[PDB]
Write a protein that binds this ligand. Structure first.
Ligand SMILES: [Mg+2]
Ligand SMILES: [Mg+2]
Lengths: 652, 652
């Protein structure tokens, strides 16, 4: 009865739905089948997938379809993070049904669920493989057949937290997930012109749905409280260490009695730690041992990891004798209070004051799939949400205040890059010659890049003002070398080592697509243009850098059209990272200012066309980098100014 | 057969569709009726509306409905620009069907179809009444009954050229239309939280559709060529007049022989006019009289209007004896070439390389209306478009270059405002005391505002550096007084005379809504917060101002929640104006830089909370205004820099 609108809507279509055993994906597969499509449901777990297949087949028979076993197939054991398994899934689907009409890129994992500074690099990479690279990989395998037959549809199941065309949505503690969701949207935005007219590509971006948060909530609330304690201790130690003569080792030794009141009362402890202990005693529940003990062994291990990953020298056994605080570390009251805060916060987003169901979101999506006139769009099948957003793409700016520029005198600057040699030369010379920096550490990828920069900067090399380090694929170890030999950085500028590739993004209708950007090449693009910046941001924040500008690839008036597309894919996707880590840093009292400077524009017509305009552009680049990297003087770092100067992106 | 998906989808609903006799609106009414809703179709023309009603009723009977005359009613003679007629339409609809479930705000006019500087003020107002104020008016009449019954839906039919959440889409020669379309979207964005949970409000924003451009196209191409000639002559005269000792009257006298070659060869004519004549001879078709004659009587009249509206003194009969050039002024080849350019440009926007039909857009909309989980959204039922966009809402900026600030020494500044007395005081003092302006003309609304500013600025008043003018509702005449008495302006800052109202935006479920923002109050809001800026921008551009900052209302940490909503409605809607007039100016070689400085933020949490942060905010305001109003020195106004410095909005 409720399905009469659906029956026939997609008759004759073949759909592949990843993550099709449950959630939105299972409902999309169910409703597509009811609408008349033959569906392949892919998932990890065989049992749930068999149950979903049986449910759908039974419903099809109830409404009158025959031979229902021919209309719903399953592909169990399918881990979309594995390229080999994606190849197997496509072969299985084409063997069952022939050419796929609709690719529903629905599979997604939650990811690492940590702040960037607690996020293992391999965990970030895994999230990108599962949630983003898999979407390109399946498109790359199925679009040739779609184009050959003259029609197809790619739908990437993104999220409200993937942002929108000209604004990022910060998702603290979920930067890997947010980047993956933004990339799914950006893929549709930039590939639409290449895939048209035969193939539509769009994203859906539902907000919260009933069930997407899957005792467990009490456990997550406790982790929230444990990570707040970690953040407060870490920020106080980092702050104390930069203005105290004692080493980080000696500062951590002040925590070893694990006694809040004793630390507060210790007249020789740094003010930052004494004030923190006072807050723990005041803001803490008297029945919670966290009000009288500084940490537990779990927090201590995670804190030690942060310190080691920031290059601070401490024995691995420093916390081996830490007194264990008695249970409960946080009270049930504190934990339930935090859990209600999380829940009420989500429900408070909803203008309509009602949580959408997976079924309703899937229904809206199945209707939307009938629309043949949309491509490159993000459809919100549920929406109406109060949430913070960070507009991107401001182009009108000037230099920072003289007060901020004065903070650069005597500073240690790190510049990271290789292919943008002109930009790196101009930046090093600006910091050293105009703004009185003490030294620039130039961190390149290869010996050839190092020699190129040493020759361009020969005068500063000879004077001891320009040091070079060759990082290869070990940027964190290279930063550690810089810390040990030249000192911790103030301002840092991170440019990509590699240029963008110049291969086709789609193939001709009758071709084998052999020259089109491969699945491995797309993964390499993400490594060099997204993971590069994440690794630097993670390491620099852990190492107490004062500021960090993340710089995207350069487009010019002569860049190929494919370079424009990939550059804008990267620009939009990186905005999600910048906005998220900016808010993470702000909310955890980290002083680092992280922002993005875009050398990519949306349209060739905006680019400089003669040497004068090119000189104007390069001057704008220097001004933009100074605007985001000049530290805030003490008389200026208010809550108000702090929000302004983090998480933003400006376009040169 | 194609309608089986539709039958029953909206059974039991009552829908009011304005502009329902043709176009998308007629198809939405048709498909809603087929889906089971009872529909009231409102339109101007009785005959087309009767034909549409008969078509739909016949189709309903074919699919099995009975008593079809009870399911499709019409309201002819309905001009949505008239508040009295909107009241009549609601009474007629409620009398026919009872409470309306779906309000489809579809009626729209194309508007004035002129550049801002050729746009009559009453024509702009009429477009806002027809396209935007009418949408609020019908919502204000129907939402009380929707809320009382516990459910309703408001759908505003906007356009791709209304922009999106954080980006404006410039629509040159259509600024009134674009503003009206952006306002329709912004209404949904800001009212959603107040109308929830009972009422959904969304916009649709289709792109080009088959038929929306309605021999006529050849006529529009000719107007394009005539307005290009107008723009080129006007820009050259304005430019010549600012650096030539002769009056505008004497400069126009050089055009009276109407002889292109003679003007080019006149050694005493200003270089700007001689170079223009050379271009007319070179770029012109030899068979077109526009290659040998400067203008015709139609262009001359429109040029004289621009000059008079900019305060230049010329006899009304100056062109009475202009030699009439022989036909054709532009050749058929030139006209057809321009027409193909327009057509191919539109078709070239489409990723899918196919023009959507009204039926297909309506079908997508009728499916979308079934979704109960979206509010405050803009759905694109067709899309996939290459078009320029202008991101809004950058917050990270600094002062302009010292080279630009030097252009302010000796300048004549106009400041327009009344309620923002602190901002006006700080601005006048910045220009006079820090940047060496010669004089500030303070243009206020009332004598009380004038006296307030004279007292705040007493020292500069006594010194002859601050002049006050009282404008009332005659801002153009006030600017003319300033031009005559104090000289033409360089930088201009336009702030609103009036604050935002503090009335409720929705009523309680069981109330009569008597205190809720009235239809007249909404029209007044548009007059004071949108039309105010349009009138100033039109007049200042015609009067050769060097730059213009349009300033939106101020939100603070203590603004009411309704003030935040209305302020953000205004901010988003004005972005469409700023972006459009910025591109109009750029593309027609006008030197004026027009940009927007926003004193409104999206969220209370971003606002300053103490006197230090408030001081930081006010300093940011001054910096933002200087960044957009300091003129570009001669060594800087390239095509590249010119695009950057026009049409942008920055958030303080
Ligand atoms: Mg460039
Ligand atoms: Mg404010």
């Amino acid at each position: 009865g409720w399905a009469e609108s659906l029956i026939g809507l997609h008759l004759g279509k073949v759909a592949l739905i990843t993550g099709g055993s449950a959630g939105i994906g299972g409902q999309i597969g169910r409703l597509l089948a009811l609408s008349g499509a033959r569906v392949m449901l892919a998932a990890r777990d065989r049992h749930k997938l068999e149950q979903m297949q049986a449910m759908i087949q039974s419903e099809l028979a109830e409404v009158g379809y025959t031979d229902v076993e021919d209309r719903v197939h399953i592909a169990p054991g399918c881990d979309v993070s594995s390229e080999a398994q994606l190849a197997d899934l496509v072969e299985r689907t084409l063997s069952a049904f022939g050419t796929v009409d609709y690719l529903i890129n629905n599979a997604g994992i939650a990811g690492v669920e940590e702040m960037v500074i607690d996020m293992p690099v391999e965990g970030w990479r895994h999230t990108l493989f599962a949630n983003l690279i898999s979407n390109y990989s399946l498109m790359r395998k199925l679009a040739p057949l779609m184009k050959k037959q003259g029609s197809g549809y790619i739908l990437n199941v993104s999220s409200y937290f993937g942002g929108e065309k000209d604004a990022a949505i910060p998702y603290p503690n979920r930067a890997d997930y947010a980047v993956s969701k933004a990339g799914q949207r950006a893929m549709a935005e930039v590939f639409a012109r290449f895939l048209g007219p035969e193939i539509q590509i769009n994203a859906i971006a539902p907000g919260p749905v009933e069930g997407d948060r899957l005792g467990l909530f009490a456990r997550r609330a406790r982790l929230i409280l444990e990570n707040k304690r970690l953040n407060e201790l870490h920020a106080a130690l980092i702050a104390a260490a930069r203005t105290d003569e004692r080493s980080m080792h000696e500062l951590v030794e002040l925590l070893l009695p694990n006694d809040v009141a004793a630390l507060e009362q210790n007249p020789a402890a740094p003010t930052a730690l004494r004030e923190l202990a006072r807050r723990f005693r005041s803001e803490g529940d008297p029945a919670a041992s966290s009000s009288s003990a500084l940490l537990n062994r779990s927090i201590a291990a995670k804190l030690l990891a942060r310190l080691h990953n920031g290059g601070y020298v401490l024995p691995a056994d420093i916390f081996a004798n830490l007194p264990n605080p008695p249970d409960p570390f946080f009270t049930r009251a504190q934990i339930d209070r935090e859990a209600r805060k999380v829940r009420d916060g989500i429900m408070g987003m909803l203008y309509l004051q009602r949580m959408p169901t997976e079924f309703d979101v899937a229904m809206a999506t199945v209707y939307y799939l009938a629309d043949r006139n949309v491509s490159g769009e993000t459809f919100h099948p549920s929406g109406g949400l109060r949430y913070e957003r960070t507009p991107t793409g401001g182009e009108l700016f000037g230099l920072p205040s003289p007060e901020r520029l004065a903070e650069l005198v005597g500073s240690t600057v790190y510049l990271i890059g290789e292919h943008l040699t002109e930009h790196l030369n101009l930046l090093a010379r600006a910091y050293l010659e105009r703004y009185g920096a003490r030294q620039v550490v130039m961190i390149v990828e290869t010996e050839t890049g190092a020699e190129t920069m040493r020759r361009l900067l020969h005068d500063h090399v000879e004077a001891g003002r320009l040091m070079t380090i060759v990082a290869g694929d070990q940027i964190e170890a290279a930063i550690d070398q810089a810390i040990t030999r030249y000192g911790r950085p103030g301002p840092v500028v991170c440019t990509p080592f590699r240029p963008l590739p110049t291969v086709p993004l789609v193939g001709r209708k009758d071709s084998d697509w052999s020259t089109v950007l491969s699945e491995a090449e797309f993964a390499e693009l993400c490594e060099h243009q997204l993971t590069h910046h994440f690794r630097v941001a993670r390491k620099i924040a852990l190492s107490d850098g004062a500021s960090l500008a993340l710089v995207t690839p350069e487009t010019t008036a002569t860049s190929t059209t494919e370079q424009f597309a990939l550059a804008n894919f990267i620009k939009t996707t990186l905005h999600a990272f910048t906005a998220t880590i900016g808010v993470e840093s702000e909310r955890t009292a980290q002083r680092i200012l992280i922002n993005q400077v875009d050398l990519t524009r949306r349209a060739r017509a905006e680019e400089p066309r003669d040497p004068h305009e090119r000189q104007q552009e390069l001057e704008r680049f220097i001004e933009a980098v100074l605007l985001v990297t000049a530290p805030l003087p003490p008389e200026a770092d208010t809550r108000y100014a702090g929000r302004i100067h983090r998480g933003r992106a400006i376009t040169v």
